[model samples]
Target: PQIKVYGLAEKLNPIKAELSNILHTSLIEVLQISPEKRFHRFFPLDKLDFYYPSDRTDNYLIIEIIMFEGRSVETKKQLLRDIFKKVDEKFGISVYDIEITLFEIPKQNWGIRGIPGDELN
Candidate 1:
């Protein structure tokens, strides 16, 4: 069964190439990743999904991140602002109109294992 991945067209080229270059990987690796334990949320709703994988599995660098949910647009916007600031400060990229979405996932609803909410502990 093939799953469809999508994103914004503008980011398709550079972003895809960048992820491929940095990860030294390609798109096929994403399909191999267990959907239940991977970060698919980074596929910005405003962008398109691009896949390019590396031949060497050991070269993959997987990092997991978690953030508390924001309640309002103001909070979300603030978070984006902070993200832009950090990107500029760290990566030296001046970003703008980076479409982002905040999905509220309750603690009890998320887990890394088969048991619900067990992963948090």
Candidate 2:
């Protein structure tokens, strides 16, 4: 899966490593993905442009995941719950402050290195 995280620069830059590992470990446990399968990108460029609900704080984070479609509903739910718990334990970010989105696309719908995703070994 490909993961992207967005948050305020001041709150995000310093915790990038810990946050990424939290996500990596969560994915590995919940999704059974390989330990080396880590692809995370962060966007901490927002100053005052990023806006959220009134109750949310500057520590709010948006995590987006794009993956091949196949996992069961329960599997995804477990991943979400595990992530929420571990992330909160590590960074103390409220569940509401951290938003996660999962985008699943068919393998055939993706093109990698000029070859269709399903064609890859």
Candidate 3:
């Protein structure tokens, strides 16, 4: 599972730790790097200029997540709902104030070689 966020909202430490605690997952393995570089994988703060969408208001926050090996569609939906609930509660914001998008991928369809082509083969 992977998650990414945008904007100058609160620091991600609490959120990341919360996710790790809830999911019992570790950060993806990678080579040693500086603190600034290590943060890239968890949040695209450095690439925000190119990736963030600004059509929404300043108070709007966007969270995009991808979970691999989700057991079922219903489970995935429930997980998303849970995450949104927690985030909303922590931030003291309505769920509607946040925009979340989650995607699931089957392991067979993704690989280091490359993702399957747009044809969805």
Candidate 4:
């Protein structure tokens, strides 16, 4: 599984390390993902590119999860809820400021270790 986070450069830098761990923990707890399997990428954006509703602050974050398709709908929903709660508690970020989207693709679509993901042990 892979996680991508996007947010304003200033707001994200301070909490990047902590936030990544929080996200990884949520994935492990909710999605049953392995700790060693964590892959996260953060894209810090400038003011012009990062935009949100006026009511929200610059701390707004967008999280995108990309993984092989297998988990149930309930599981996915639980992961989202878990991430939202954890992020809010840790960063004091409102649920409104957090946006999460999950992208599921077939294992065969992924290549890992020079082989199709489905062929991996």
Please tell me which predicted candidate would have the highest lDDT against the true structure.
4
TM-score of candidate 4 against the unseen true structure: 0.95
Q: lDDT value for candidate 2? A: 0.93
Can you give the lDDT of residue 32 in candidate 4? Answer: 83
Off by over 4 Å in 2: none
Q: What is the lDDT of candidate 3?
A: 0.49
Which should have the higher lDDT, number 1 or number 4?
4
My TM-score estimates for the predictions, one after another, are: 0.37, 0.92, 0.51, 0.95
Instruction: Provide the lDDT at 112 for model 1.
Output: 44
Quote model 1's TM-score: 0.37
What are the per-residue Cα lDDT tens digits for candidate 2 across 43-120?
A: 996677798888998889999999989999999999889989999999899998999999999999999879998888
**Candidate 4 error regions (>4 Å):** none
| Stronger candidate by TM-score (3 vs 4) | 4
TM-score-based ranking: 4, 2, 3, 1
**Over the stretch 1-121, how does candidate 1's per-residue lDDT look in tens digits?**
1112234444433454444232222112322333343233223333123342434221122222243333466654555455445434543334532233344556566654575553445
lDDT of 3 by residue, 61-82 (tens): 5666665454567665665577
The true-versus-predicted C-alpha distance at residue 113 of model 2, in Å, is 5.8
Question: RMSD in angstroms, candidate 3?
Answer: 9.0
Sorted on lDDT, best first, the list reads 4, 2, 3, 1
Q: After superposition, how far is residue 38 of candidate 1 from its true place, in Å?
A: 6.1
